[PDB]
Design a binder for these strands. Structure first.
Ligand SMILES: [Mg+2]
Ligand SMILES: [Mg+2]
Ligand SMILES: [Mg+2]
Ligand SMILES: [Mg+2]
Ligand SMILES: [Mg+2]
Ligand SMILES: [Mg+2]
Ligand SMILES: [Mg+2]
Ligand SMILES: [Mg+2]
Ligand SMILES: [Mg+2]
Ligand SMILES: [Mg+2]
Ligand SMILES: [Mg+2]
Ligand SMILES: [Mg+2]
Ligand SMILES: [Mg+2]
Ligand SMILES: [Mg+2]
Ligand SMILES: [Mg+2]
Ligand SMILES: [Mg+2]
Ligand SMILES: [Mg+2]
Ligand SMILES: [Mg+2]
Ligand SMILES: [Mg+2]
Ligand SMILES: [Mg+2]
Ligand SMILES: [Mg+2]
Ligand SMILES: [Zn+2]
Lengths: 38, 196, 119, 249, 160
RNA sequence: AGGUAAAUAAUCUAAAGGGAAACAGCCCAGAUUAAGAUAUAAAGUUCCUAAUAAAUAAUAAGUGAAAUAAAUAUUAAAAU
RNA sequence: AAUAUUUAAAAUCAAAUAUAUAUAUAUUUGUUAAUAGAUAAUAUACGGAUCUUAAUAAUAAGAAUUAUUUA
RNA sequence: AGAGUAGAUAUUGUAAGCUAUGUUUGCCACCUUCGACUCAACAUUUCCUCUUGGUUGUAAAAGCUAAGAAGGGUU
RNA sequence: AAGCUAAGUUGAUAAUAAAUAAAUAUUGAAUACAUAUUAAAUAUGAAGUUGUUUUAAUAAGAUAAUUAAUCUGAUAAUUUU
């Protein structure tokens, strides 16, 4: 997980999710693309 | 909306009823609310199981062609519309389970990676690289069977429950990338890394 | 800023209503001033007070300041005024180039209707 | 015939609903508690002496806890008292010493005027012993573990060195008039006060002390004593509770 | 002249029931309503110098309304004085410990005026999580109300 | 910079009273002595605390509720 | 539905006022929100309590927030 | 931007941009003692211990980096 | 010698349990796909939290006695646990 203020989806296989009052970006292909909005 | 509008086909052996609950409960959001009153049931050959559902939703049972429909009092209400697509899908899943039955194959991959029915079906012992013994009890409704040691099958009427159980079983050892090695639920895949 | 001048950045509902009332009062005062002048001019020409009050053609004030006040482009009425100009002054050093009118000193007495065209 | 009474509609027409159970109830607390499944017995710490294990040859210091007229006076129950416990009484006392009220209580419970009374809390109603019975050292098995409560030796008004193991100031190198003192007792102004529980000189000892998991070395009903491995809090002739160890089995 | 007469009834401490299951107010609004009653502002004979407020029995307090997510967010604080001993409990935790009645009591306490009579006023509030309570028999009642209530219920209440 | 230097106005200085939780300088308003019926100012009107009812929208974050924290990010919403 | 901007009453339209007046001229007014970003040391700190409403069911509650208003 | 055998975002992150802190060196002028010993209390921006995400740069083992975490400990 | 002591001796580092954090899932719409839910349902998850354990305080409750040839205390004496 890259925890950061800015949370953009990198590849096409990335998908944005809204859980626990935080924007997560998970990804099905590349595991490096996992991000979390703060 | 697009899901909930799709009509559900029923075979004569299965019966989709609906009726009010004994003690209706109300889900209270911040602004909106949602009163769970009705209780849909899907009785069939393999078993019977139910869905507790809001008041705004209601069925529309047709005698001709075995179709039944589901509709809400206000489709323009967002929460209702969201519920509608869920409930229809749930009752479809139930129909499928009672008539055919839901299935979940777990294939174990690794040297000495295998499952075993320990308590005459009531406890799936799983041996997946651990000094301590691992496993968990099968829930009510779920029936487990092992064609091979390295290939377990979970079977049930509830699609939710079986696939949850399968996921729990997997969680002891999910597939590693370096060697495709672990517990694979149904058609599960993994991109294997180069060895180097 | 160790001393605490605890003044809120915006006004309450009740404050805004009072401001509106004050704005309305100044417009009323202006109207009365113009009306009295008109009445006086009618009397000079030779009508009674009642006749002057009735008169269709109301006389506009000849003095400059009064005439400017009458114009809504220069001095707008409360009903004419924008929501923003009732409750926000122009302040070039503020962010947004705007500041609450309540932050102006003696805002209850001092009048300030017209802000710049795009600020 | 009937008495005059008026009743409010609001209280009469109120739909009946049971209150939810609260954590700070007695019954919830009882359920939470870590308790022994069996009663205990009061003893006196008579002294201390060596116990030689005859197989191995190992020597162990053992305290001799004497068991005299130990008797279940009465017991308490959840429905009446909020918990299950056995009121045990030890020894024999004169009439002269005992209060009239206490004598009457003992007569009611049908025991002799007692030297020391104490409760022994238990998990269930099964753990309660029938009242009036005599508890002997054979209650406990040899090799079993027991918890041991008693009031410790009184040490009097002690300093922070003895109380809390404070290092104190140096013996030489200029040290003036404060060799055994606690040094600083606070902080300049932010606290502006010595904060509660600041370790200071005060009275020490003469407080209760549970000692957990002590091994019952030896039991004999002939001499009326329980041998117990190691130390027990308090002086000689001090009353000592003994119950099964909750931690060790 | 207006003051002269028998004042005993005016200063009588009445007992006010409130079935929380029936009442549709939220917690804080209910607490505020109670506070007035407890003070005695409702009655015209009131004076600030004299405590002359009524008893308030609250019942079925488990069914109290709380808006938003305050039941799992709202934190009740406490502090002895020794630093590092700030005790912060969420509303649900407080309820689990004591009840919904404790929560109501806290609100009512905060509503009340901060002086020597505050504690007395707080004491007069009698809150109950469920229905059954000892003060059932002493809530204010009238003979004209009796026809509304069925026959055996009254007897059962009296027995209780 | 609660800094420094002057320009204009006000207050404090030498100004009590109401408001701004508390407050030299801010918002009202100038105590000759009382009285307490009527108009009120600024500021307020669930309770603490003197006094309130409405309308139409928006928020669901306790955001906020008398001391507004930025670039940027995400999710919506309108208009083209 | 999709792509890409803008978040605007300058223009434009709508509504209102004033001059000849069923029209013209001049003036005035009307164009997003939420969350994250967010952060230290005696103790929660809107001044405090507390405030987002709910049919059955009340002679009865339903912001006490923000914005535009009324009595 | 640029390093990272290839790929800016595993790890690294020039100069310029937007903030927080009041831990340093200053500035202001309302206001006229460093270290050691002793006992420490508090914070968390976590050094160790517990849980977890990422790591063509996680095979294993050692690491590196990030999220939760102040219970205990930290010559 | 007693006592007091640590260089000495003995014990404890307080479980089971419950709800959680980051994180990991199930079914599943809103949004024909997807999505662990900032939807309804259903699960995992920490030396942390609640507790548990220990000490001190308090005294709801309980047993008994109730104007006393020896009711319950205190003053007094001999003392130390
Ligand atoms: Mg020394
Ligand atoms: Mg000396
Ligand atoms: Mg200065
Ligand atoms: Mg002077
Ligand atoms: Mg003054
Ligand atoms: Mg002057
Ligand atoms: Mg004067
Ligand atoms: Mg807030
Ligand atoms: Mg504030
Ligand atoms: Mg225009
Ligand atoms: Mg604070
Ligand atoms: Mg306030
Ligand atoms: Mg490069
Ligand atoms: Mg730089
Ligand atoms: Mg400083
Ligand atoms: Mg941290
Ligand atoms: Mg490794
Ligand atoms: Mg703990
Ligand atoms: Mg789906
Ligand atoms: Mg899915
Ligand atoms: Mg744990
Ligand atoms: Zn990706």
């Amino acid at each position: 997980f890259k925890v950061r203020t800015s949370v953009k989806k990198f590849c096409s296989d990335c998908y944005l999710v809204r859980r626990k009052g935080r924007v997560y970006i998970y990804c099905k292909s590349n595991k490096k693309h996992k991000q979390r909005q703060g | 909306s697009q899901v909930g509008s799709l009509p559900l086909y029923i075979s004569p052996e299965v019966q989709v009823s609906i009726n009010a609950l004994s003690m209706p409960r109300i889900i209270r959001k911040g602004r909106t609310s949602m009163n769970i009153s009705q209780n849909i049931t899907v009785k069939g050959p393999k078993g019977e199981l139910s869905v507790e559902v809001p008041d705004f939703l209601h069925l529309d049972k047709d005698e001709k062609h075995g179709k039944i429909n589901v509709t809400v009092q206000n489709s323009e209400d967002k929460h209702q519309r969201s519920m509608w697509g869920t409930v229809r899908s749930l009752i479809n899943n139930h129909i499928i389970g009672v008539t055919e039955g839901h299935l979940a194959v777990l294939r174990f991959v690794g040297t000495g990676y295998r499952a075993q029915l320990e308590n005459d079906g009531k406890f799936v012992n799983v041996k997946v690289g651990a000094s301590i013994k691992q496993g968990l009890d099968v829930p009510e409704g779920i029936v487990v069977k092992t064609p091979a040691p390295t290939s377990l099958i979970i079977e049930g009427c509830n699609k939710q429950q079986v696939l949850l159980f399968a996921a729990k079983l997997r969680k002891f050892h999910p597939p590693e990338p370096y060697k495709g090695k672990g517990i694979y639920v149904n058609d599960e895949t993994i991109k294997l890394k180069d060895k180097k | 800023g160790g001393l605490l001048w605890k003044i809120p950045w915006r006004m309450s509902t009740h404050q805004k209503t009072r401001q509106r009332e004050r704005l309305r009062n100044v417009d009323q005062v202006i109207k009365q001033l113009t009306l009295g002048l008109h009445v006086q001019r009618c009397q000079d020409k030779g009508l009674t007070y009642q006749e002057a009050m009735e008169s269709k053609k109301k006389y506009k004030p000849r003095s400059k300041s009064l005439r400017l006040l009458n114009k809504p482009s220069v001095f707008p009425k409360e009903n004419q005024m924008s929501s923003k100009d009732k409750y926000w002054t122009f302040d070039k050093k503020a962010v947004g180039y705007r500041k609450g009118i309540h932050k102006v000193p003696k805002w209850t007495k001092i009048s300030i209707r017209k802000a710049p065209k795009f600020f | 015939s009937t008495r005059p009474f008026l009743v409010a509609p609001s209280i009469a027409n109120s739909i009946t609903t049971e209150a939810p159970a609260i954590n700070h109830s007695p019954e919830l607390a009882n359920a939470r508690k870590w308790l022994p499944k069996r009663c205990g017995l009061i003893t006196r710490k008579k002294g201390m002496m060596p116990y030689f294990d005859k197989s191995t040859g190992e020597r162990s210091a053992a305290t001799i806890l004497e068991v005299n007229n130990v008797e279940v006076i009465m017991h308490r129950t959840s429905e009446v008292n909020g918990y299950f416990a056995c009121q045990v009484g030890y020894g024999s006392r004169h009439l002269s010493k005992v209060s009239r009220q206490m004598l009457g209580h003992f007569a009611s419970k049908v025991v002799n005027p007692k030297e020391h009374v104490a409760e022994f809390r238990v998990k269930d109603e099964k753990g309660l012993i029938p009242p009036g019975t005599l508890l002997k050292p054979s209650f406990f098995k040899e090799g079993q573990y027991v918890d041991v409560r008693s009031v410790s030796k009184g040490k009097g008004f002690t300093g922070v060195m003895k109380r809390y193991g404070f290092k104190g100031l140096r013996a030489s190198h200029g040290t003036s008039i404060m060799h055994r003192h606690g040094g600083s007792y606070g902080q300049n102004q932010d606290p502006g006060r010595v904060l509660p529980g600041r370790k200071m000189p005060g009275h020490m000892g003469n407080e209760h002390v549970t000692i957990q998991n002590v091994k019952v070395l030896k039991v004999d009903d002939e001499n009326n004593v329980i041998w117990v491995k190691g130390s027990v809090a308090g002086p000689k002739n001090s009353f000592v509770k003994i119950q099964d160890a909750i931690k060790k089995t | 002249s207006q003051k002269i007469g028998h004042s005993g009834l005016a200063f009588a401490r009445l007992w006010h029931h409130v079935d929380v299951a029936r009442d549709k107010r939220t917690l804080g609004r209910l607490a505020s309503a109670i506070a007035i009653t407890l003070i005695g502002r409702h009655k015209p004979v009131y004076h600030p110098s004299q405590d002359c407020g009524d008893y308030v029995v609250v019942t079925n307090c488990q069914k109290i309304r709380v808006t938003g997510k305050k039941f799992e967010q709202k934190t009740y604080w406490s502090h002895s004085g020794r630093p590092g001993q700030l005790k912060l409990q969420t509303m649900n935790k407080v309820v689990a410990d004591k009840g919904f009645g404790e929560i109501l009591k806290k609100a009512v306490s905060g509503m009340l005026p901060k002086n020597k009579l505050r504690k007395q006023r707080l004491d007069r509030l009698k809150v109950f999580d469920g229905s059954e309570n000892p003060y059932k028999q002493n809530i204010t009642a009238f003979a004209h109300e009796q026809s509304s209530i069925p026959e055996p219920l009254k007897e059962s209440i009296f027995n209780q």
